[PDB]
Amino acid sequence: NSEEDVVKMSPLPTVENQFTPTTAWSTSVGSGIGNFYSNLHPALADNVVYAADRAGLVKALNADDGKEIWSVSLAEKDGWFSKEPALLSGGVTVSGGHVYIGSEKAQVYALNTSDGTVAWQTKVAGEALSRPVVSDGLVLIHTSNGQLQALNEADGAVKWTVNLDMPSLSLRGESAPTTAFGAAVVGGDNGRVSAVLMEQGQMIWQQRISQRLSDVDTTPVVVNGVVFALAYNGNLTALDLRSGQIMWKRELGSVNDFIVDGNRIYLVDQNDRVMALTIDGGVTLWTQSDLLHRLLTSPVLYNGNLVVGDSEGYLHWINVEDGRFVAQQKVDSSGFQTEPVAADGKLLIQAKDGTVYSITR
Amino acid sequence: WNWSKSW
Amino acid sequence: KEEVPDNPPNEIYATAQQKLQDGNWRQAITQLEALDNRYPFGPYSQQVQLDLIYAYYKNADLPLAQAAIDRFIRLNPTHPNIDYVMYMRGLTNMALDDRSDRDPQHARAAFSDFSKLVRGYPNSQYTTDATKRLVFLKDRLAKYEYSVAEYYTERGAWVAVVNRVEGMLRDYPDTQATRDALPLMENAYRQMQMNAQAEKVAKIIAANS
Amino acid sequence: FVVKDIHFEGLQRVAVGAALLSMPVRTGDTVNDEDISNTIRALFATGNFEDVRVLRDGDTLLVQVKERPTIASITFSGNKSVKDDMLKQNLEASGVRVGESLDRTTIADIEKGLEDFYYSVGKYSASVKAVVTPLPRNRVDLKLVFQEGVSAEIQQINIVGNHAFTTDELISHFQLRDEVPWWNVVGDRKYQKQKLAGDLETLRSYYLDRGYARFNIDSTQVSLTPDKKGIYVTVNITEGDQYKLSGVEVSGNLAGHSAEIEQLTKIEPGELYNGTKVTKMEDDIKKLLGRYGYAYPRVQSMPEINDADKTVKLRVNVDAGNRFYVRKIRFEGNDTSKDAVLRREMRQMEGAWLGSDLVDQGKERLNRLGFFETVDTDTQRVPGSPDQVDVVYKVKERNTGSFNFGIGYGTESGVSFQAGVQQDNWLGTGYAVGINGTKNDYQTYAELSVTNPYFTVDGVSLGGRLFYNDFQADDADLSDYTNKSYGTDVTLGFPINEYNSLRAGLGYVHNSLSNMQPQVAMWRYLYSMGEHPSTSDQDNSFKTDDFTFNYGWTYNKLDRGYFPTDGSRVNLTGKVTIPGSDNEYYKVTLDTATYVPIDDDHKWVVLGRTRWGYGDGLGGKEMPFYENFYAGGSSTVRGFQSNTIGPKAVYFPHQASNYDPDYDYECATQDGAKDLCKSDDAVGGNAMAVASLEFITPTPFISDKYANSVRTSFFWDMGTVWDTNWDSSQYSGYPDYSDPSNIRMSAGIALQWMSPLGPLVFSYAQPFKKYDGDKAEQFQFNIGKT
Amino acid sequence: RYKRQVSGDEAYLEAAPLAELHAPAGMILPVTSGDYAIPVTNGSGAVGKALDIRPPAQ
Amino acid sequence: YRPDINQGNYLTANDVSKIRVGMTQQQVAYALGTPLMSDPFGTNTWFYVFRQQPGHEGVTQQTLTLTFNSSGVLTNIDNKPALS
């Protein structure tokens, strides 16, 4: 009885820290997302950090000291003994004094930022696995059936639904639509980037950007009227926001998100190759293939450097200009899987144990 | 336990 | 693992022939397989195939012999020395028969093969042995049918016994199983109170024994 | 271009004539560019050439062709989880096999085929590499290097849309698993399409049995994590409201049996709609129609649903077919098992009208025999006859022999070893010969058994058994005596109802007793047999021969072998020595178990067990002390040390074997003993009565996914054993052991399940009623089942 | 295997001759259909270890 | 103890009354079916036997002998509703 992997996990790189990172505080949330594949991560709004765990617990923490403001358990209990898990899997979002959290039971909760009381709770078509995007007074959810639904912020009733085709075999997780100029662009698990009007849900256009071969898009981004969409095992593409004509393409696929800054596109290939392409034509600037098959996380641009987690929990700071490691740190032993969040000069990351860590320098 | 191997 | 040096076909073939003459089989299969693989279209591939069929049959690897014989018949239906291949297929099936109660499908296949050999090439040197095996196979099939009739007489079904003995008289009229099974049909008729037919079968029995 | 000659360059295997036939162009005809291109394409598609070049020489048409190298051998490296033979079969089915040619451009095709095979078998990240090694004579070797990778296992089975039943309860019955505890045996944690379809059907049947007629599975999703090491399954469903069964109507060509069919479709107005009961009704109608000679009596049910009042009204359509007669039952594949062995398991009879249910019963019986891997049926119509068939059974045979060696533990018996060699189909004759042996803390048993299961076509069996049994009493919490016995046995068996099974037989048993500790119990029996041994020493011996006639009876109505939830088992056994044997006694025993479920899901159960026994001498003698009844232990009365209830020994004053201080001796002569001496070690009595009331409840603290594989019970056992021949007049000072009113009770808890080490059972009992001498043992357990 | 190691190598059995079945007067036995028929073969070839089954030189 | 033993054609007691004398083999075959037994010893005759024997309940048999002629036309019918 023995087990082996087709691709050997890359060795931990050795680097000299130009700056010594630290850990301002580390609060613990119940059992984290465990070993499952979830999009659950913290969020920041007005100097407070909201976190959650797969069990159902939700916590609010001070972004400076880690002090607890309120806590609420969303697992309904039928007495003093029975306790059914809530299975939270939608990334925590905050907007206009609310905390929108998905679930694996096709439920969307909207807790109050004041005292944690449920403002509303809605039933959706399927497992609301995607981040509950918020825009134009609507909450966009991308269920696991391919159905993009738009709940109302105030009431909580499904305003409109749009059906996106689903394949036989797909990758766990869903794409969170990005809204621009009164239109939501979303990428289904069928390799199609589709734009939908918010008023009713009329499909403006739909383009295939793919290449038993599966694919997934995971949140195409928008800049200056061009939509950058990266399909798993497919090819990164730039589409016109209005017509959908492919402007340029490149053969590289991934599921974890990427980022665009100035005239550069930093992304993490599926084989864990942190690359930096150019918007104009996608001509590569540098590549950092030293973390091959380490199961990295979505990069975050903190203080002009890409921060990325990994399976062992090590947090790597890599530069942008050339692609040289700038530092590494050992934060947690369980490992990092959910994207880091950088905002207000604060970098936060949740491990698989639910221990929210705040990093600095 | 009880192992059972056929001829 | 019984590796064969890359000697020329003549020397390896001579070694294989000498080993066959000596009375050793397991190695002969190895040398002949190596020769055939190394020279699929060699000058004397057919003789190597015949030697391989013989070695396989006499080594108790009957399925391989069946496959090789099927291939030989397919490729060379007009080979002048083909009667040998038909006889070898008959021998292989009759050996697979390896016990009269057990299924006779292999006995039936052997009987069909030997019948084809005898009807196609009656002047060959394997015809007398072919008929001597055909008689035995016919007797064995009749014995199997009689065994089934005897079991159905034990069970208590008097329409399976009659039908099976009628089938035996239709297909195997001149064997020993039929003459031993006629009383079973007489008893089956007697137990259903078809006394006229029982008397007819008794008339058949009396005129013979 | 006119052609006068045809030539080729590079032909090694393909004959000249075959090639000439292949090319449409023939000698003595005009040739142009189109003809040359078509010939080149034909050569390319033939598969025997890699590069084809047709050029025109000065007068002749010269052809340059590079024949593809022929395949010589194939090698595999790294196919740890894939058998080589089946991989080779897959390759040959794909097209690549020994003897044929290898293309230099189809390597990717073979690679992707093997990749598809690995994706099918479970490994979603496997890699394959093909290496081509040229060899002389235009030969080639194809080597395959495999990196199987890590298999993908299920991480979650989720159901969304269910409001009436929790997800764990629904998933409990599925074949696919997401939690596999180490301490339990629930199953693997892999994924397969067939399993998923079967489990969807299981879920549909689970809901339809509660009245959710409008049930509908909207859609199923299967997802993989980006690293392709986990599988997430989701089943979006929609369950309606419970529906009541208003009535049933039957219409069609019933063949004049409406009176006997309308009786089968009676239902209490207001019953909850059910999916199992409707299927059973259809099956009963089918059996009724097939009992009348019909072979394929089609029956369909088309429920009508009225949502206004929530009522389901069935509409049964019955199309009774036409009779078909069997003419031959043919068995093929039974190369070892004789024809009668297969044919005597048949419910269908040759020469009789056909019945599909009978054919299925025959197939099920042949499967239950255990000699065949696969038993397939095929009904072939006889040519030239409109209503005659031949039923053909095709059977794949196993190697039925077996070795086996097991080990177990337990407080009642200590470490118990078992070994055995069995042959269930001796020479394909049907006899089941075997040799068995067991050895635990206080005995060694070794038997040789030979059973004929069909001594008479009806089903009467006939078994024989030689056995040698050595029994050390001192190691079983009894008085000291060693009993080495050996004997034969022959037993018939008459199955009479498919539940009742009588059995009568004879037997001969020779017992040699030695090393007997002086006491009242035996020397009340030795005197009966005429022996007059000395009570001052324990160098005794006694040999007896018995010719017993063993009769019995069984009744096994239990629905399930493991964790039964409804039924009743009864087992009566007897024994009596026919005249001429040294001993003269009769013995009777009666075991009973009865389950009474007290709900609809069969989760809360009541189990009542009893065990009675009585034996005594006939011709003025007593029952031998080595056949007595012992009560108390992990099985009879939980909470008492094994074989402790009942009379206690009353030792005589005797000299020990080799006395030595610091060792406890049963009040021997060298301790100042001059009279009869009490004791606290059981002897067993010749009358036994034990009862037990058990309440089986769901496991309280176990997750509901696998809470049905652990059985929890709260039990109250009671029992007593007494010695009827004991005379209270002479031994007044000592307790009266012939009194049956001395009842011993004990209540407690019990857990049971199956671990990878075998069936584990634990029990904690607190005896709240015990008498002087009884030795209590709160915690008891058994592991491994010998 | 072991069962076939004797039948295949040399073992040979001769069975009893076939004899026709007489039809009593006033009736006819069932038609034979000639399904399993043994045609008469002339000549006296070898049999029973006297017939060499070694392949010829072709 | 044993299963049910059934043999021969199934006679419904209605078809047997549907065949008069003067029809051909085709009509009788259509009405009752193809017999499981015949008279191979020359003379043409069809024996429709309906025999059944359930678990320890004796044997019940109905025999119906049809005698045709040289031209395949029914000539005689002989019905035995039970076995003596």
Author numbering:
A (entry chain B): 24 to 234, 243 to 392
B (entry chain G): 1 to 7
C (entry chain D): 24 to 121, 132 to 242
D (entry chain A): 24 to 809
E (entry chain C): 30 to 87
F (entry chain E): 28 to 111
Direct quotes from the study:
The darobactins, a promising new small peptide class of drug candidates, bind to novel antibiotic target BamA, an outer membrane protein. As a consequence, BamA is unable to close the lateral gate and, thus, affects mechanical, kinetic, and energetic properties of the entire complex. The mechanism of action overcomes common pathogenic resistance and is effective, not only in vitro, but also in vivo.
To determine if D9 shares the same binding site as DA, we first resolved the cryo‐EM structure of the E. coli BAM complex bound to D9. D9 also binds to the β1 of the lateral gate of BamA with multiple hydrogen bonds in antiparallel β‐sheet conformation, mimicking a β‐sheet extension thereby blocking the functional region of BamA. Of note, D9 is more tightly bound to BamA, as shown by comparison with native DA, which could be explained by additional side chain and backbone interactions of l‐tryptophan at position 1 with NH of I430, at position 6 with the carbonyl group of N422, and at position 7 with the carbonyl group of S425. Remarkably, the C‐terminal carboxyl group of the terminal tryptophan forms a shorter hydrogen bond with NHδ2 of N422 in contrast to l‐phenylalanine. Furthermore, the aromatic group of the C‐terminal tryptophan of D9 is significantly extended into the hydrophobic pocket formed by residues F426 and V444, potentially generating strong hydrophobic interactions.
